[PDB]
Amino acid sequence: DRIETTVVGVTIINSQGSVGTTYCYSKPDGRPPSTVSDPVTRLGPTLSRHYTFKVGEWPHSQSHGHAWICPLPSDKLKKMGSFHEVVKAHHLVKNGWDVVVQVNASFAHSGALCVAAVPEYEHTHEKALKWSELEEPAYTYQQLSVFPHQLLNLRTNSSVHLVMPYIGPGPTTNLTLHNPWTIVILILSELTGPGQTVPVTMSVAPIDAMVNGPLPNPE
Amino acid sequence: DRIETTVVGVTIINSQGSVGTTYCYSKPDGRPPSTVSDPVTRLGPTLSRHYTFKVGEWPHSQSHGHAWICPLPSDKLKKMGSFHEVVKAHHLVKNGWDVVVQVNASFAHSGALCVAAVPEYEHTHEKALKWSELEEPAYTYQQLSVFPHQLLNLRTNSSVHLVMPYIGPGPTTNLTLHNPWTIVILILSELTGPGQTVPVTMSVAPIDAMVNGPLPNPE
Amino acid sequence: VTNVGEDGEPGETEPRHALSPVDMHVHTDVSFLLDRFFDVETLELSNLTGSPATHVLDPFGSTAQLAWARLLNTCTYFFSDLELSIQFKFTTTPSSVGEGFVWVKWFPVGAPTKTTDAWQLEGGGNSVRIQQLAVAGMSPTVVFKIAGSRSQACGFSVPYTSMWRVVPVFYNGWGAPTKEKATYNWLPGAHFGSILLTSDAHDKGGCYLRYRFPRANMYCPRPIPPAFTRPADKTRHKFPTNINKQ
Amino acid sequence: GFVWVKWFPVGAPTKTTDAWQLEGGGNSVRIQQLAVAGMSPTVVFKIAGSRSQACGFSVPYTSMWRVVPVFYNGWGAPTKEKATYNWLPGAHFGSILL
Amino acid sequence: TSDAHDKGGCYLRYRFPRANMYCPRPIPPAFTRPADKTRHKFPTNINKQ
Amino acid sequence: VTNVGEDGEPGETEPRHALSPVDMHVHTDVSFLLDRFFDVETLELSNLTGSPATHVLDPFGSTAQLAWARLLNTCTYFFSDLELSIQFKFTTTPSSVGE
Amino acid sequence: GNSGSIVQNFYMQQYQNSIDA
Amino acid sequence: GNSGSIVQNFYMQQYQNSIDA
Amino acid sequence: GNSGSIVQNFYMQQYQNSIDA
Amino acid sequence: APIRVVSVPESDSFMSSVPDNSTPLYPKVVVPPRQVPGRFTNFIDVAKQTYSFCSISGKPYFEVTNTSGDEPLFQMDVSLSAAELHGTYVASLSSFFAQYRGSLNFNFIFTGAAATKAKFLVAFVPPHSAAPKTRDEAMACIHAVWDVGLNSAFSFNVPYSSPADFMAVYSAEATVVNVSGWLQVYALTALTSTDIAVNSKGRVLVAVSAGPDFSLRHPVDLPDKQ
Amino acid sequence: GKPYFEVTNTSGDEPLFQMDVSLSAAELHGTYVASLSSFFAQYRGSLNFNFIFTGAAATKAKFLVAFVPPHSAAPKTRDEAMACIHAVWDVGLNSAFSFNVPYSSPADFMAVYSAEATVVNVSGWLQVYALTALTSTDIAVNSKGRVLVAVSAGPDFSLRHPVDLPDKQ
């Protein structure tokens, strides 16, 4: 059995495929910012549930190096429809994440992915915070296995359960400008088998959300 | 001394003018709905702070009977800019209120107001939930003193501190359709004195907010 | 006494030799004053054939101030059981219905409706139909004759149907997601049920519904409506009483 | 023959014009406003086939007076008038409207 | 049997006290199927107007 | 919850703040729902003379779904007593049988 | 079942109903 | 309330009225 | 025999029936 | 075997207040709990713990000018259907009945400029004369004097004094039982202001709280609307 | 007309299954639990559903369910629906799944009979989505996968109030 049911909020992600619960670096802490003599809101269990973005559609001839950049979570924040609404009107947010990548395949499929949670991910050509399809410089795959991860292998499963803690240089931060935790997914070994797609997927979700002081009505 | 500093969230309403802290009927209860086998969010201390709407501008020749209808709080909800955003995406809400009417006057001013918190206020000609200037049928002032209140008298102060508990026929409710607590303000004795205005005011604010299950992204 | 008014709360004075009680307030007791069959409403029965207009026992409307109307709208929410007593005033020559069975069938909040024919009593020819939902079964039927019956009436218990923990009289909001002019003070089923009256009569008589509101619980006071014009200032209003002068 | 025997307690108002009406196929027969049922006990009995066209009930002591004075020496109202001598406001048991 | 037979019918009735039931069975729909995705709408006590 | 179905037996999920009971199921109680005089059947009486058609109280037939019909055919076997209440709707001028 | 009146046993349960074993 | 006769409980209070909790 | 009602002895057994010895 | 009974002549009659219910046709209906606060069992209760503005002239208050003195300020025949006590909770409640036995209280909420003082007098005139019309006539009765300035309102208890244990909730031609008298307030000192210019008149609210010994007995249907 | 939906490797956005959670909504028409109901007038229960996936044993489908409380007018893409209460599930070793559609509403009992939009009729929708378009050994052998939608009465569910049957419609 590979029962991998993970709950936060009231979004119960069951999914067999998961093999392990990889905590990236550490366990998340709820102890308010060191530098905010400012009254916070511990976002509730609803809201800070999960969301689930179909990531992209893996293809066939995709030469090792291609990844799905996922600066968690701006651009794709505008769809976390209750949590989203909150971080709009609240300067700064101290929150880790939980994400469960998922992929739909079979018996006749080669192709593995090094899906990893990157701290202060460089790159994203000043077009960052924009989830998309940038390649990486090759070796990034020889070494992308150094930033806490979990690979996906069509010959063993369909998920990667990356669970991370809060990070940023200062003790909290403006999530409309600084994405510490940014997830990637690189193709270690190209895809091979039956001609159908192989759609990719991912269930994102905030954790321990606390956002400081409200902001002026948008009128 | 008539120090009347009332705090909820991090909106500290100090105001001398208040004379009493009138609890309407009862003290509010935080014990989740009886009929919602559904996971809730106890809205935090930020958000459920206060807001403060200038109500209107009392005039002079206003014959006893005129009141400021305030179905708390729809139409004027769209301005409670962080709490507002939440009740949008969450079916039902169990919450009382706290409100502090305030009025700017002097020495040479007659005019008193019976400001009261009405349960299941009738009226508002199917144009309800709309804060405005409807009159009342006269006697409503002879008896409007029966629905828990506190009057305002320019010869003694400037506030009325109505603090209410949650109400509605069912154990919780859709605040975009059912305003239990609707505040009024009737002119018992016309205004008299110096020719300047006499602007009215009011600091509204939710309390013990719990809103059930999220709703689809608005896309 | 010096009153520092304005903060709601009344203010008393208390004389000397304060007066002793008697009566004990008692006659002002909510549940008590409301536990008596009132004459409220009055309708027209159905012919057994055709489609009915399911009557609904919603006594939270008022208007004709028969001191039961105001009393119900003195509270905000109300919860009580019900009990009825249909009677039936003959409208013409009280010897034209040599039988008149009347299928008084009560229905609980939510029961379906659409009642066309489905029953039929076969006997020598003719055969007289009965309303489909009228027959006996789930929801309590009462068959009483309108001939020789020294009281062409019935009467029974009807415990609180409605889903609401309590019945809201005046609703400020709406009844359905179709914020429509009607569903304002409506709210889905703030009531006690329905009743379908069918009998070979329908004409040649009416009824006089009645309500006995045992276990009446009232909440959230409200102002009590005058019911009488204003008089001439300084003076008394003078209604011819038991007392009076002559 | 329905008979709306309605009893009233010392002091109950009066003025009873129409206000009720029973609608049924046409005609419609009115009932007296204060006659209907409610506060003060009504009794509806038929005058046909009824093996005793009668009724009957309790009526506890209404009147305000600690006791009922039969013969009063004084008057009933500040209008010392020929009538209010042995009258006294409501030295009685009530009324009835048939 | 009665000197009647015609000029009237009857309406039998049953009161089934001490009803004991065994071996469940499926319960018959009693109403057609509607239009997919939606609700069936029978005029009730409630309803809208 | 992950269900390993197929072997008959249902499968539940149980949310948070599970909901308190009230009503107690009670109104669904078999014996109870069936202990009430229903209007089932309807016939024509006999003349005293001649030979009769002995009527038989077999209420296990159903068809006109007056919510008593279905309810009896929700079970396989049924055991209960009976109690009847004949009434008799006059079919013409209700003053032609003086007895 | 629906017989909550304190007169139901005017006829003792032998005449009233049946009996099992 | 107005039911002071010693026959009101012929039908026990379950059939009579309702119940709260 | 067929008299299982608790009212049969309204008339005590002397008036009701007979007696032997 | 069969019991012997005899129907009273009355028998198969109605009775719109039979102390005893009817036949329970639906049963076992368990009912859901109620969490709404502000509930009540007794009606007197609500009118005792709650005032209501008496309607003088069309408004709930009289005036006080610096040109009054002798004249009466407020007057009304203390009976639960006298003009002023018409719109009040306490008086409107009453008409479901026929009798009351209570002394009433009134509260005088003075609303004039905070630079205004009015000083003043109230008086209860038991029934006898034909309405005294000057304090000099009225002060010889039961009265109270009050000085606005620092008070910010006042309270006067119009007692119950009469030979009958209950009176009439309905007014009518002069009876020993209708009228309990008058209630009067006077200008024991004509009003004053910083400037007669800025502050013309002062006002005062007349709120009616049910007395502490007051009760209504006897329910009665409503007559006609008049 | 069948008791199951499909799962192809060409879905994605589109809704998979939807119905207005009220005991006379299409799907819940033939069920025991729903057909029982009509002897009455009221229910107060959260329901459970079990998704018995029946595709080839060489098929995997992964997936998403979602409960949409009443408000909007039916979200029509998971991206809209996932912002509500939902559950994701991966067939492959499970061999079916269970989702409990709770009870959340201001009324202590609702209607066993559906009717024009009321605050008491509709409890919302029940939705299932293609969070990952189906997959097979060969798109050739295995075209589609299916899934059974079984309805178990919830653990807090009860019917109150018996009522005669109206007309047949």
Author numbering:
A (entry chain 2), B (entry chain 2): 12 to 230
C (entry chain 1): 1 to 246
D (entry chain 1): 100 to 197
E (entry chain 1): 198 to 246
F (entry chain 1): 1 to 99
G (entry chain 4), H (entry chain 4), I (entry chain 4): 16 to 36
J (entry chain 3): 1 to 226
K (entry chain 3): 58 to 226
Copy the relevant paper text.
Crystals grown at neutral pH only yielded poor, incomplete data to 3.5 Å but possessed 120-fold non-crystallographic symmetry. Averaging rendered the electron density clear, delineated differences on the inside of the capsid compared to the low pH structure, and confirmed that there were no major changes elsewhere in the particle. A structure–based phylogenetic tree constructed from similarities between the biological protomers of picornaviruses indicates that ERAV is most similar to FMDV. In contrast the surface profile for ERAV extends to an outer radius of 159 Å at a prominent crown around the five-fold axis built from the extended VP1 loops (Mengo virus has an outer radius of 164 Å). The ERAV structure reveals the presence of capsid pores similar to those seen in FMDV, at the 5-fold and 3-fold axes of symmetry. Residues 14–27 form a hairpin contributing to an extended β-sheet which stabilizes the pentamer interface. In FMDVs the protonation of a cluster of histidine residues (pI = 7.8) at the interface acts as a switch to dissociate the pentamers below pH 7, whilst ERAV, which in the native structure follows the canonical FMDV interface structure, has fewer histidines, consistent with the somewhat lower pH at which it dissociates into pentamers (between pH 6.5 and 5.5). The similarity between the two structures extends to the calcium ions bound on the icosahedral 3-fold axes (liganded by Asp 195 and Thr 194 of VP3) in both the low pH and native particles. Similarly, there are no alterations in the ERAV pores between the low-pH and native structures to support their involvement in the exit of the genome.
Equine rhinitis A virus (ERAV) shares physicochemical properties such as buoyant density, base composition and acid lability with foot-and-mouth-disease virus (FMDV). The mature capsid comprises 60 copies of each of four proteins: VP1-4 (with molecular weights of 25, 25, 22 and 11 kDa respectively for ERAV). VP1-3 are composed of eight-stranded β-sandwiches, with strands denoted CHEF and BIDG respectively on the two sheets, which form a pseudo T = 3 icosahedral lattice with the CHEF sheet exposed on the capsid surface and BIDG to the interior. To investigate how similar ERAV and FMDV are in terms of structure and to probe further the cell entry mechanism for aphthoviruses we have determined crystal structures of ERAV at two different pHs, using highly optimised methods since the yield of purified virus was very low.
